[PDB]
Design a protein around this nucleic acid. Structure first.
Lengths: 330, 330
DNA sequence: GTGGGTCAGCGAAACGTTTCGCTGATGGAG
DNA sequence: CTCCATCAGCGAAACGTTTCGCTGACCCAC
């Protein structure tokens, strides 16, 4: 392929001038410009962003780490991120940690080695990035949730899972339910833990007891919700209602109840978390805690770009407001 | 941060030697190796993949284009691609065309400018990549669905949607249904069109009529299926069964029927397409045509890397095998 | 004319890595 | 002693792009 050097040779000029024509960053005469443009079209010049990135030390690339699965939540989140990147002139490199910590650190190292301009750290997993790696490479603008903790510098977005869990439970309490169970995510994941504590707080505040087996762990996926609900149906004291740690698990709950020939909400009332697209299409439609997903992706990018633009800003800190979407499940 | 040059200076050696220590590509004496390793740890050397890529003319990066949405199919596909990339030492750049053609071409140009080693072109929309762009940049290994015509040279995957649609309809015919409708995707998308033709073929072969309003278009999404089914419920002749273009649309169908207080399969039998994870958790569980998703992602990468490794090879053509999963919906 | 001054545009270095000729040392067959 | 054949490791070019110090062509107060 033709380089700016090949262009310059044919137009009989310096590569400096070729750069200036292309970038419009320093005055070049109309004649010279025309010659260069002719040479570009003639040779069919194919610019290398790679080579530009090396010299400029910026790639217009964002790296994103997630802990993804069949949970539709992350699909909507990624959609928002990718769209926002495109609109802002950035590429998206996607990494799935898949729970594994070495995998996560290996992903991170690759991203830093490829000199991404910014980082979305949206892993849920307990682990935090090897500081060895972190402090080896130049610091980059970073956004993370309160999900994954971390010792370095980053802008922060808090999901307020605790208030969400409280709100969800409080809603069931306000509907008059007193036997309320909680299907949670893996308790080593912060959002799962916080939602459980929200549930506990609302129950305690209303003086309602939590039977021994009323808190059950699932995996934040369909199957986890299925398994957990089956277990709950074994309990001596049948729940009137269940708060599931997310919408994915609620899908599994629906399936368990279908198999047990139980109706929602007539036999059991259900409330989820996330308000994924699917929630609205469930039968009955799922009452749930709305959290930003696509919108969250867009917000995280906006934060990240603000910092790229103004590198010396103080730490940015945002919080989401959980909101209840009332439908037919509770 | 330290470069291989800084390392070389401290260890008092050539950068050639430093490269050889790091890459293990030519013999270096044990003493030299040790000194270099010490220098690496001492300076805390941070390798640049950027700089390596420029010199090597390879980025160990794959670009992937999809026409994504809420459709869970693409979530599972991307998961397979990303995992396969990771296992093979590649990064994944993800692009969503969102149907738009200029957006698609803009994505392509960025990827080529960043010199990705390979392309996964898994857009459903009909447009062809601007040849201007294509023939401007160095040609790269490419895998695409056998949907769009000649469009340069690249490896191909046939999904066998036509035989799938035929099989799905034939199944309903074999269950004794005679009034069978078809909810399809946008007919400008090849898999949607092919599935419709499959339906037509099976109907014709059995000599069953297709009433005028029995073929309805939606977008390959929950709400497309919802809208399309509502329309079908308006038809003077109510269908006994419906083949939906994919599982996403079947979700919408379920929701429409729920609102019309109609039961599956008692009032209407339903059969979908992808066998997404969710299919088996639906109420009732969805009868559908299985096709590879995660496994498709893995296969596409394997093909792409085989070509990177052996550029000599002539066009690969792979075919997927649809499998019918009989469940409770039909 | 004419010595001095302005700025377009020159040649070319260099972001950090891989690759390449080249050399000097060492090793066995005279 | 020759000398001839191998390879370890050096110094540094160079992938393709910006960026810099310098020049020289043209305008202008003498």
């Amino acid at each position: 392929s033709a380089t700016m050097k090949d262009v310059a040779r044919l137009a009989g000029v310096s590569t400096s001038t070729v750069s200036h024509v292309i970038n419009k960053d320093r005055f070049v005469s109309e004649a010279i410009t025309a010659k260069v443009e002719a040479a570009i079209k003639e040779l069919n010049y194919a610019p290398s962003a790679l080579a530009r990135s090396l010299k400029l030390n910026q790639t217009h690339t964002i790296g994103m780490l997630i802990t993804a699965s069949t949970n539709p939540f992350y699909s909507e989140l990624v959609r928002g991120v990718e769209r926002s990147c495109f609109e802002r002139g950035y590429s998206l490199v996607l990494c799935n940690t898949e729970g594994d910590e070495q995998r996560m650190n290996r992903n991170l190292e690759t991203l830093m080695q490829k000199r991404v301009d910014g980082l979305l750290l949206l892993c849920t997993e307990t682990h935090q990035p090897s500081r060895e790696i972190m402090q080896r490479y130049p610091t980059v603008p970073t956004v993370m949730m309160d999900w994954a903790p971390f010792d370095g510098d980053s802008d922060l977005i808090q999901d307020n899972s605790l208030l969400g869990g409280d709100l969800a439970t409080q809603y069931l309490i306000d509907k008059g339910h007193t036997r309320i169970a909680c299907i949670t995510g893996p308790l080593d994941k912060t959002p799962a833990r916080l939602r459980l504590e929200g549930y506990r707080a609302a129950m305690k505040r209303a003086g309602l007891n939590i039977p021994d087996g009323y808190e059950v762990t699932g995996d934040f996926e369909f199957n986890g919700g299925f398994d957990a609900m089956r277990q709950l149906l074994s309990h001596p004291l049948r729940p009137q209602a269940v708060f599931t740690g997310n919408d994915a698990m609620a899908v599994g709950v629906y399936q368990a109840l279908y198999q047990a020939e139980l109706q929602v909400p007539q036999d059991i009332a259900v409330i989820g978390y996330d308000d994924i697209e699917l929630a609205s299409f469930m039968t009955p439609p799922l009452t749930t805690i709305h959290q930003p997903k696509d919108e969250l992706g867009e917000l995280a990018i906006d934060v990240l770009i603000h910092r790229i633009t103004q590198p010396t800003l103080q730490q940015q800190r945002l919080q989401l407001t959980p909101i209840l979407m009332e439908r037919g499940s509770a």
